[model samples]
Target: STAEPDLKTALKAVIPAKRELFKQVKERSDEVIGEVKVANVIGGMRGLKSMLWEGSVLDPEEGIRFHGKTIKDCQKELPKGTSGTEMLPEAMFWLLLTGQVPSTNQVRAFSRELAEQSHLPQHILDLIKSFPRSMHPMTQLSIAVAALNTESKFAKAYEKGLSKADYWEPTFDDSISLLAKIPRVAALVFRPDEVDQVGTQALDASQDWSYNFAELLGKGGKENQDFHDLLRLYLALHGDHEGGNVSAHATHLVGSALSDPFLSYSAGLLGLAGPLHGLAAQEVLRWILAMQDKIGTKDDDVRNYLWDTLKSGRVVPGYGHAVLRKPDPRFQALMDFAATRPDVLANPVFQLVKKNSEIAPAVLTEHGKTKNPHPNVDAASGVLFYHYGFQQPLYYTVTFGVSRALGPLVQLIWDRALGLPIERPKSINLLGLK
Candidate 1:
């Protein structure tokens, strides 16, 4: 039987093809299509193309497509472990990196690689423990990840004068190492007390990557299996969604300077720490809890609460998206998962979220401000986390960062492989008007 190429081999083969494609574009194409304006400059450079981002694309009406596969397609096709109904995150990462689904053997081999590298060094653990309990988990996470730069194979190799063609090898090593270690770092940062409570299990080499993360978080056994399943789905879905989002953009921008993956991803985590980005899910949960406190989950009450929120000049937290013009497939995917669990369907908070999703879209449509009035992933994500006993809102973004590292790090490998230069877009001066 013929087997698929290992990641490094596959990437090596791909690099030359992509180099040829870039050469063709550079030499033959005059793809000049538009001009920049003050709004485009000041408005966060909202639709500008400054770099290349593989892995996924977002459509206004259709939602995100990971390497040309929809969420439903991923669910149906990506490799899954025994008893898993969703795509394994390892498979998702494989797809994100290679743009193809991996065979079960390939997925298992990757899982073993991650498991072997998952152990945290003592100094890193000491660094994590040194932070005050009051420190925000994302801050702790970002700092800890930066500290891991000491172990960066890419940085060491770069200083030793490795050729550009071989840069992705060390970068890939660092990326996988970071991915393996982050769950431990995250569990340490978010739940240090629980580290002793559940008795930290040695990384189970037999299990998939997210299963190890769930185990590190002290969630295990048949009873807590839902959390594991949820985690698999969560990490896979949040893995990548284009490169323009704050965290993804920040990672790509930083990595273009030839920084190691750890350093670049640390920069991305800082961006994810912002309230406008990764905090949206937590914000959505908070808004829902407040609405639940003020008014019970009657349909009329939910509608009234939404109307009053709009009337009070506050936008509904998760009902609109900058790029999506319809309901997010990620949100729909989560809702589909929730629908299968009886507890989620019956929970009052989830009911409110469901009702709010239903009512807010119509309300936002009537209010006529938002172009997309449908629920994004944020609207329902935190509620699931809350239900699973991970009630701390502040720690949610850390998980987002963990999931988000998949895309930009992969992009970094490609950027280095393709010899992409540093990113520097010109800025305009409005005060220089004649």
Candidate 2:
């Protein structure tokens, strides 16, 4: 083993720098030119509304790939597993971040690291405990994280004239610290008081990422392991598709201005909180459930009512994406898991959903709006949550934000370490002549 390690080190020494190729690759890439325009950018809605609808990476015409694979490619490789070598999304995120697929031993090592990182400072825990239960968990998350920024080393370093590169390592460390503590915070916040015969279990390092989330949720069991796996897969795939997503771009742009990861990521989280973006998952489910409740559907009648809803010229909350022209591979992956689970299909509501997804686009096509009918990640996520006892549809987006935070943080570290240049957008006023 020692000899192999030494040989690998030697091999690395023999390899020539590929830096020039990377630079040339970027240089040869096509560039898009835009005219000076006063478009809606962030902070456009006066006080709380920040317009995040600028150059997104996931443009339907041209998709983004990670490590030479599409989202579909990633899903096919990282499958759900009760046993065997199924790679969890969390592990995959680490792979994507580090550019090496971790061995099972390495993944186990990473999980142990997470366990160590999960410990919270007592004052932070006290802050979590002090919040009233009625306070929106997302609000608590934002404020608590913002409060922790008072302790950031980057803030201190800037005051002390530390070099830019030196500032990133501490920021990276703080980001890791923040990410590890999130699940624990969520667990402590929502942990129920009662115990049942169906007890909770410890997180299994070998299981998929959603199982880890379920374990954190303190509702671990085997019945929903596959569902949790699918959920995690969905979350992981969508985590950071590319840099131009609102959250990602916001973080990158803000970070370029020397904002710390926590603050930059917080800015990004605020973007994801929008109804048009990550929050759409929760809203889509609530809309559907409300429709189901209002229509008062029996198991048999649900499908017909769903068809009618699709026929009505209303936007099915989650049925289309802004950027994905093809089916969201994450959605398709969840569908694959659902295909295996009879219990998932047994729900008439789910049956109604499948029928609508199949038929709704065709209906929209007839009306000339077919282009907008693509089913997004939101379309499938709610049902999985429904199966997992997360009936509060509004909580879905916040949960997504938690899962997504990891990728952006990883990117933040990469951007900082690589000395990604400062980002400043040129703006022009149209109201008055220059």
Candidate 3:
């Protein structure tokens, strides 16, 4: 009957199939495979199947499918809150790992486990505080996460010769603890005053993990339901995108070296801090505001502004994607949430974003510069955070790091479970360049 097993049982069941495949590949390692061309090396290995990332796959036309479920399917099937619209991040994480929708009781138990492990050591808290206030939030996030390596259960267990079959257990423990503690660490950067205010309100057992994080960030209360719901949707949608992207790939690459999840994820967050990666959303917001400030949001002016942007040798920040040819489903999901609330839809900045989304694609398509001119998740993501009073762009990537942990950590657990080896690709000389 295809009934969903608990996580361990599910992993146990899947491991054999994976192990058999690995054995088959190893046995045929000497077989001639597809030839790697010169462009494949020079072009950053753009289409290589050199890594194993199981969470989601990005289709050039269809957007991401998490465990074969589309964003719409997840929105309808995954567990939601009392409001019953937005999917919870815990349910998303469970589905990412197990390819099954967890029951409500399973989600609650998982939420409590996250809460139970949420507290940080005093030293880690002090370390976060010791950073200069001028430090970027992503910088603080990476540093704090690296500092967490000291408490890594996997590192200690590995020293004791833990069986390879059991490696996923401690990796799971470290991942959940790190994920639970990130919001607190991030609060230390983006909202220190709110941190002080919420310090006394301990983690409420009744609340889900994302709401707990929202409360700690001072964006949670009865009146902040919209913000809370937005946070849930944001976390769930941003949780993972395929593994080929810089952040996810870096996390897997670093973890392959036997680094614990903390170190591995911290490495990934550093890549996420780059302008080409996690900063795209903030760049989209900035460019939108700049255009609005300069040209205003009139329909004719918006078209002229997009044309001017292209003519001025600049591309629209959020309108193009490397692999996606259709509109990003993540973008559509956020826009759908925004449509449900009058306040969000009425925001002038959001209106500008919507206008841009409507106008930019046609302009770019006619410009003949981009292969895929449709808007991506970045096109709509920043508007929601701006609407909710979280305006600091520097803090945005840190929040991204929080959501990004789900996929890489899940991949890490599976990597260890599958006993995957360290990654090393052969290098070719420049003389071989065609």
Candidate 4:
């Protein structure tokens, strides 16, 4: 007989956290090999090796799918255009983070909360003012986060009398606070001295998070709503995958070792810096745009252009993924969004990108680089950003970082509430490989 379900709500519940419930399972041994085989493409290489952790994937042959849905599924459900008939990516992100498909009422309530939280502290604004104009905005973002780390409750709590398990909530709170302030930080850095604006903008509680953020970008209104929608979807889909991914693994590993959230997240940021993972999208877009400029718009030979890229021994930047044998759901989802927008078709780069997406996989297969050729999340993101008037493809990761902040912050909260212990692992190098 089933025991009566407990209706009791504790002030701070100590519910047990389980990874398998989310469909991520630990490998049985330290030196596990593939249960299945695929092509030997560089894009599909990362998933082959055994690591301390493996993040959940709905489809390994295809690209990563989150929460049992593809990006295409999300586009079908969420906002794609200006009509506001569908839920926006910002609203969807909050729902995904909470693991519930919120009703419209619930979304409105959450959007209000986020809007209220968007203000950056004045001292933080002052911190931005002191930086030289030559600093890369991404660099300034890292430094600003480092400076905020000084105020981390988890870090300070440890300095006092708090034990390892007790550091979770403070870590959680810091993540939330820090994420809320990032757009402000970004806006501060993005503002040119010539523009004549010196003060951080006040949070506009009346608008949705995306609209408010678009406002902070210092220009663009309703015409830029698609920009907001694009960013929201991008952030929601990319926020977290399974483990094994450097960012997720680093955070999990460091958190396991009892490091504070601020420190663990810092390590995760470094992992995101890796070229094979999060940074791949930036590189992919740059390559695409550079090709377009060099060749001067050859509409008919777009597929050939991709073949040339691969022939030169440079893997198609976003064409394949380490684990995805099929196309990435996120890439497919963005393609759906692209399909819905007539304006996107007019952009020759996007048209060429679509052409390449169709032809490149078969070429990779013929060359024995892949059994299944699929585009990863990076494959389509640059073209989407290009349509929005963003030229500096190098900063795309920074945009991704802004969206991803929510996932780590949410997980940090769950870890604290569950009293997760200090996480650490053991390693040894053989044959002087260290």
Ranking by TM-score, best first? 1, 3, 4, 2
Q: Estimate each model's TM-score.
A: 0.96, 0.79, 0.94, 0.80
Greater TM-score among 2 and 4 belongs to 4
Per-prediction backbone clash count: 0, 2, 0, 10
**C-alpha root-mean-square deviation, candidate 1:** 1.8
Give me the overall lDDT of model 3: 0.83
Candidate 1 backbone collisions, by pair? none
Residue 293 C-alpha lDDT in model 1: 88
Give the backbone clash total of model 1. 0
- By TM-score, the better pick of 2 and 3 is 3
Which residue segments of model 1 deviate by more than 4 Å? 1-4, 194-201
Candidate 2 matches the true fold with a TM-score of 0.79
Alpha-carbon error at 262 in model 1, in Å? 0.2
Q: 4-104, model 2: which lDDT tens digit per residue?
A: 22212321332223234446656965765343333343334222222221111353543545555655555555433454222466555664555444455
Better of 1 and 2 by lDDT: 1
Residues 255-347, model 4: lDDT tens digits = 666566656666676667667666787787887778788778653466677667778887776765545566777777778767767898788
lDDT of 1 at 401: 81
